[PDB]
Amino acid sequence: VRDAYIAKNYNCVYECFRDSYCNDLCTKNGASSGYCQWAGKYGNACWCYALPDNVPIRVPGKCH
């Protein structure tokens, strides 16, 4: 499992503004927790906590 910017299709996240949405989103994939986090490198995103292993999260620089 991991803590990271969850991906969508091609190393892109869910640009969310409702931590709660994440709290539901991440765990919905099987994460233990879920919060929307933001940094800059890739902007804002959902930081899934203890997200399972089958979900390639994203960290490239730019989504594509």
From Swiss-Prot:
Q: Which Pfam families match?
A: Toxin_3
Q: Which GO terms describe its biological process?
A: defense response
User: What is its subcellular localisation?
Assistant: Secreted
* Membrane-spanning residues: none
Report domain LCN-type CS-alpha/beta positions: 2-64
Tissues expressing the protein? Expressed by the venom gland.
UniProt keywords (A-Z) are:
Disulfide bond, Ion channel impairing toxin, Neurotoxin, Secreted, Toxin, Voltage-gated sodium channel impairing toxin
An example GO CC term for this entry is:
extracellular region
**What GO MF annotations does this protein's record show?**
sodium channel inhibitor activity; toxin activity
Q: List the disulfide bonds.
A: C12-C63, C16-C36, C22-C46, C26-C48
Family the entry assigns? Belongs to the long (4 C-C) scorpion toxin superfamily. Sodium channel inhibitor family. Alpha subfamily.
Its biological purpose is as follows:
Alpha toxins bind voltage-independently at site-3 of sodium channels (Nav) and inhibit the inactivation of the activated channels, thereby blocking neuronal transmission. This contractive toxin is highly toxic both to mammals and insects.
Record remark: domains: Has the structural arrangement of an alpha-helix connected to antiparallel beta-sheets by disulfide bonds (CS-alpha/beta).
Q: What is this protein called?
A: Alpha-insect toxin Lqq3
Name the source organism. Answer: Leiurus quinquestriatus quinquestriatus (Egyptian scorpion)
